[PDB]
Amino acid sequence: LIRKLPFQRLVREIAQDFKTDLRFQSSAVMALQEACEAYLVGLFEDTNLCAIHAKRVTIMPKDIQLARRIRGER
Amino acid sequence: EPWKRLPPPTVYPVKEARFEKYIPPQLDGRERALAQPPGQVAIVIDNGSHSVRAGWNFEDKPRLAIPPIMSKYRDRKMGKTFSFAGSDCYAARSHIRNAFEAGTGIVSNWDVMEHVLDYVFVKLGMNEDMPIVMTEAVANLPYSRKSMSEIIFECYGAPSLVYGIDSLFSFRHNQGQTGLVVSSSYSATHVIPVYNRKALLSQAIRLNWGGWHMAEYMLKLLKLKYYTGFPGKLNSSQTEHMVRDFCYVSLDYDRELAGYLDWTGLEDRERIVQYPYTEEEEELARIAERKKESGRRLQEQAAKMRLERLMKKEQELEYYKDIQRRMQGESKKEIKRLLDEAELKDEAALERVIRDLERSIKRARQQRLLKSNWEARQRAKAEKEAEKARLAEEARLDEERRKNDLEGWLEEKRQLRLAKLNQLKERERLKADLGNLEAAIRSLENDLLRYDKTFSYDMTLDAQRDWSKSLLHAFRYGPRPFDPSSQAETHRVHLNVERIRVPEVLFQPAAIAGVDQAGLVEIAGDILCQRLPSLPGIQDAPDAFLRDVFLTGGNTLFQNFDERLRQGLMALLPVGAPLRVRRAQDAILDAWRGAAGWACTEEAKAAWITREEYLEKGGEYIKEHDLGNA
Amino acid sequence: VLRDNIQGITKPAIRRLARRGGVKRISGLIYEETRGVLKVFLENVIRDAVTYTEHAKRKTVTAMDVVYALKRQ
Amino acid sequence: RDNIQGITKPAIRRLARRGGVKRISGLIYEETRGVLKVFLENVIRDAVTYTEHAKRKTVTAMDVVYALKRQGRTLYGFGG
DNA sequence: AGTAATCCCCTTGGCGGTTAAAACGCGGGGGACAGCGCGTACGTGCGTTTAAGCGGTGCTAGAGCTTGCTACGACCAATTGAGCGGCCTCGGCACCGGGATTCTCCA
DNA sequence: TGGAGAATCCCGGTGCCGAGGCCGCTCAATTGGTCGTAGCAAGCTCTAGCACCGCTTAAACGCACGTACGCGCTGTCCCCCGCGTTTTAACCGCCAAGGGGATTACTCCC
Numbered sequence A: 001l002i003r004k005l006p007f008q009r010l011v012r013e014i015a016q017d018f019k020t021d022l023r024f025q026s027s028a029v030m031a032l033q034e035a036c037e038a039y040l041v042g043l044f045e046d047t048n049l050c051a052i053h054a055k056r057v058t059i060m061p062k063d064i065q066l067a068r069r070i071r072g073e074r
Numbered sequence B: 001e002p003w004k005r006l007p008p009p010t011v012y013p014v015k016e017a018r019f020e021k022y023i024p025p026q027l028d029g030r031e032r033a034l035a036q037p038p039g040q041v042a043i044v045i046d047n048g049s050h051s052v053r054a055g056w057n058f059e060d061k062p063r064l065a066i067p068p069i070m071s072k073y074r075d076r077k078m079g080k081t082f083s084f085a086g087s088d089c090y091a092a093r094s095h096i097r098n099a100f101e102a103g104t105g106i107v108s109n110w111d112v113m114e115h116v117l118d119y120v121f122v123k124l125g126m127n128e129d130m131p132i133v134m135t136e137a138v139a140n141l142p143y144s145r146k147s148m149s150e151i152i153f154e155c156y157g158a159p160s161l162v163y164g165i166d167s168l169f170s171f172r173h174n175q176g177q178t179g180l181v182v183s184s185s186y187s188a189t190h191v192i193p194v195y196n197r198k199a200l201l202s203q204a205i206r207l208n209w210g211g212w213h214m215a216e217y218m219l220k221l222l223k224l225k226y227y228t229g230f231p232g233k234l235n236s237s238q239t240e241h242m243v244r245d246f247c248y249v250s251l252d253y254d255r256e257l258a259g260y261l262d263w264t265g266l267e268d269r270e271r272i273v274q275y276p277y278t279e280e281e282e283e284l285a286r287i288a289e290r291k292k293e294s295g296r297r298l299q300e301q302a303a304k305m306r307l308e309r310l311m312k313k314e315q316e317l318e319y320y321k322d323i324q325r326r327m328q329g330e331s332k333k334e335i336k337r338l339l340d341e342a343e344l345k346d347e348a349a350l351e352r353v354i355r356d357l358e359r360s361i362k363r364a365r366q367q368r369l370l371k372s373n374w375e376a377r378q379r380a381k382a383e384k385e386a387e388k389a390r391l392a393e394e395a396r397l398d399e400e401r402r403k404n405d406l407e408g409w410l411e412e413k414r415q416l417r418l419a420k421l422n423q424l425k426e427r428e429r430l431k432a433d434l435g436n437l438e439a440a441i442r443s444l445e446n447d448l449l450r451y452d453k454t455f456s457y458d459m460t461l462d463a464q465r466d467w468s469k470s471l472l473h474a475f476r477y478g479p480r481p482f483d484p485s486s487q488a489e490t491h492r493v494h495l496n497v498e499r500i501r502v503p504e505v506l507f508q509p510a511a512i513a514g515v516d517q518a519g520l521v522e523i524a525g526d527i528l529c530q531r532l533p534s535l536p537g538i539q540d541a542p543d544a545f546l547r548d549v550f551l552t553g554g555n556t557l558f559q560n561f562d563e564r565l566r567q568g569l570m571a572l573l574p575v576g577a578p579l580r581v582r583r584a585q586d587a588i589l590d591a592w593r594g595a596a597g598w599a600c601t602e603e604a605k606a607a608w609i610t611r612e613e614y615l616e617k618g619g620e621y622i623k624e625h626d627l628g629n630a
Numbered sequence C: 001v002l003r004d005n006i007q008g009i010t011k012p013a014i015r016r017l018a019r020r021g022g023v024k025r026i027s028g029l030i031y032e033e034t035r036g037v038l039k040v041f042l043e044n045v046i047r048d049a050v051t052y053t054e055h056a057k058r059k060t061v062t063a064m065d066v067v068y069a070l071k072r073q
Numbered sequence D: 001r002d003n004i005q006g007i008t009k010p011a012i013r014r015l016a017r018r019g020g021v022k023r024i025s026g027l028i029y030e031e032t033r034g035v036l037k038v039f040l041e042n043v044i045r046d047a048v049t050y051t052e053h054a055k056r057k058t059v060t061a062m063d064v065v066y067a068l069k070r071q072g073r074t075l076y077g078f079g080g
Numbered sequence E: 001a002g003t004a005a006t007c008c009c010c011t012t013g014g015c016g017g018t019t020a021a022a023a024c025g026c027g028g029g030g031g032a033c034a035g036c037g038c039g040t041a042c043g044t045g046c047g048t049t050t051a052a053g054c055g056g057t058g059c060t061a062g063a064g065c066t067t068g069c070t071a072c073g074a075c076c077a078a079t080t081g082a083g084c085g086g087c088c089t090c091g092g093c094a095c096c097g098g099g100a101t102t103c104t105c106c107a
Numbered sequence F: 001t002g003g004a005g006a007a008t009c010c011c012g013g014t015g016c017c018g019a020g021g022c023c024g025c026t027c028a029a030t031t032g033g034t035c036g037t038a039g040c041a042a043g044c045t046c047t048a049g050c051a052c053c054g055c056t057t058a059a060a061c062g063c064a065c066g067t068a069c070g071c072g073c074t075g076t077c078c079c080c081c082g083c084g085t086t087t088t089a090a091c092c093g094c095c096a097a098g099g100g101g102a103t104t105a106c107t108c109c110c
């Protein structure tokens, strides 16, 4: 769902904060992407319930923030 | 096999509501209208939720028949507004709205209704004064009567208006003196008792099921049948044409249903509807070579790991044999000490490991080491070669067993097959939870197939798993094999049980679609048996009504609809009751023909409301009369 | 050097991820909120995946290092 | 026996006050009892599993703490 | 070496009372929830352009595997004192009462 | 704004029981030497990770514009709160029991 090359570049860009000139095995990036897509999809499910519960069909930033607050991510 | 014997399937293209041609303003109708005698001309509008039908009272059929829809939009390229109000909308952009509240007989989008009426008067050829007869829902809401009257008198200025009921116009057109009028339309199903040409609307009942609901319900059932995925865009406009073309009423639902998916004869019970699919060596040799080398590399990697496991297991085997060579003629402490170097605990555990390694191995400066590793492969090759010797002679022994004890040998294959199936059952029925042989089974079953005249393929384990022994394949794909590769065999729906399940909602509303209302036979029987004999002004009830149960509206046109209703009512009435069920002639247009014939009679002109009477009384007011609402 | 690549997860990509989560309609402020979510997640996965890589004194991060990092969530 | 009704309305009120709740629908009380016993039916079956596997006919505080810790709700104070 | 009586201990069960907490009644308030109007903000469709994806070429970092040994931890026996179980006490925290300060609500 | 009165705080007094320190001793941590080995180091192999080019077209963006839906507003009514009354069962204490686990006796069997 996310385009592969701009996800590679996002991974590299993040990693440089921890160790310069790391290398990533091709299978390691796909394992990160497949976990991120599965994480975002699974969070949007939980936000959609937060909108629907507030009688809103349209998800809103406070729906992300309620989902994460109850999942204990914040 | 049946699918090899059966003919090629017969397949029907998808139909949908489609535009076909333009029609101009029909100025000859306006000319003829101006030629009529005074007070003998009117415009007749059958305000049907499926079709608005309109024309001149002096003519035998409508000039117009259009869906009560509008489409209006701004062309993003040309920059101008376009507007459409019937089948002139292609049902090219389908920005459609409908005048009626979905699945009901009541007009509620008055902007669409005005556009529909604009199209009606334009195509009838009015350009600037004419009396209007318009059909109306049973027990129609006063607010909708008001809103329709306001449009007719204040937007269009018409001299007089009258409302009547399409069900009752249809009855009077067919000489309806007294009877029970049964109407199934697009929006609804009604039973109205009619006495001395006057409807007893206080005793009428509505079902809330009709030809719209059947199209929607057929759509739900098809989207469920192919829930794993269907490539065509399933629309209820298509399922309406499927309901028209293929559905029929059962004369004995439970007996016809219980056998409907039986593989024998399903060829003639199924009907197949097909959506518009699209039809889709150096290249292969080079690619296959790259595949072949990649496969060879995987084979080498497996064999290299297998050879590592061969050398490991043989070196392990040699160590465990080195223990055994000591343990024979050494103390239990020496047995235990050598076992402790293995961290094993039993001589027979070394025996098991020695054999199990051999049982595994049989399946699969430097020169002294290299050859002794190759000698471990020769120890492996001795197990491998002794495996070859074992199997060849054991098979020859069993071939003698077949010759010499054939029936007992067959009986052995049954006993073994069952025992192996028991282990598979002990695996699977448990592992279906506990997860949270097969070649032996086959080989036994193969010899049983080869020589056991008691055996059959139908008891083969594979036959227990075969698509042609399933039910859901018959439900989804019928008597014939299926593959998702074929673009022609995908993009087709098999209607099967829905041939009969959809009409039967009229008779079994709660059981089949949860409508939570009495079925058609129970509605009609409650009127005939319980209500009309109680109503004190009526004479010769029920019997006078039984002599004409009358079917009206398009959604009655299913095959066997009449005989099903007759046989259902026959069981509710006293023996020898003179029950007749009768169909309207041309059960769709016939409601307009009744309104047109009635339009200018003295009965109608007594019921007409003039513009000035509307201005006096307001739009809720109506002249109560035989064919209209109270 | 790399900068601003979090704008590489486009708004259509966030639509696809939301629709697959069953969402009907999306407030226009979701798109930056989703990035603040994805980045805070992907940082603390990669923090461990790299920690498992400088332990064992190596320089490629492997799929197993990713797997061990996810397993720590 | 139904000592779940011994989790009274005032007690479910007090727990919601500590949870910071101002106003409570009267339907909440039976929902909360249904949620409480589903919690206990997970922790006690594990605390029993420990006493059973450790072959004792009494349930100790540490059986519960292992049960909780394995359920994911680490409790400090009763051993642990 | 076995099986049963004897005896410790610690858990469950019952009885009484006392009083503090749960249940019950009742007025009213204000918060839940359906209804309405608008308006702006999100979904749709089109033309645009941007770069992700694929097939292909080139290099070298470094993952992965083998060889060789010696530095470091496993194992045991003798030594001893750091850490645990039991006893003591006094001072911190609670618990009460009473007058002082705060906050709430109707005027 | 005031006021009345209830509810929350504070100040000093009382007492009880548990926190902090002392004592005896065991046994678990330390000292000393042994020995096996594993993982630290040096070295070779070639996998696969990174870089670049050129092409294709599907995917991303900016914009027009309609209408579906979020939000503040209004009205009601019902139902949950604050407070007085009634009642029941939680808490405490004291006695019983039983059970079970370790120990001790006495015989038979090896």
Ligand SMILES: Nc1ncnc2c1ncn2[C@@H]1O[C@H](COP(=O)(O)OP(=O)(O)OP(=O)(O)O)[C@@H](O)[C@H]1O
Pocket (backbone or CB within 6 Å): B047, B048, B049, B050, B051, B105, B166, B184, B185, B186, B187, B188, B210, B211, B212, B240, B243, B244, B552, B553, B554, B555, B556, B557, B558, B587, B588
């Ligand atoms: N031959 C047919 N067999 C079965 N159903 C049919 C047939 N022809 C038409 N229909 C269906 O019957 C319905 C047409 O009903 P009809 O036109 O009589 O009602 P209407 O006047 O439009 O509706 P209403 O009175 O509910 O507003 C549609 O659902 C149509 O698909």
Ligand SMILES: [Mg+2]
Pocket (backbone or CB within 6 Å): B048, B049, B166, B185, B186, B553
């Ligand atoms: Mg009709």
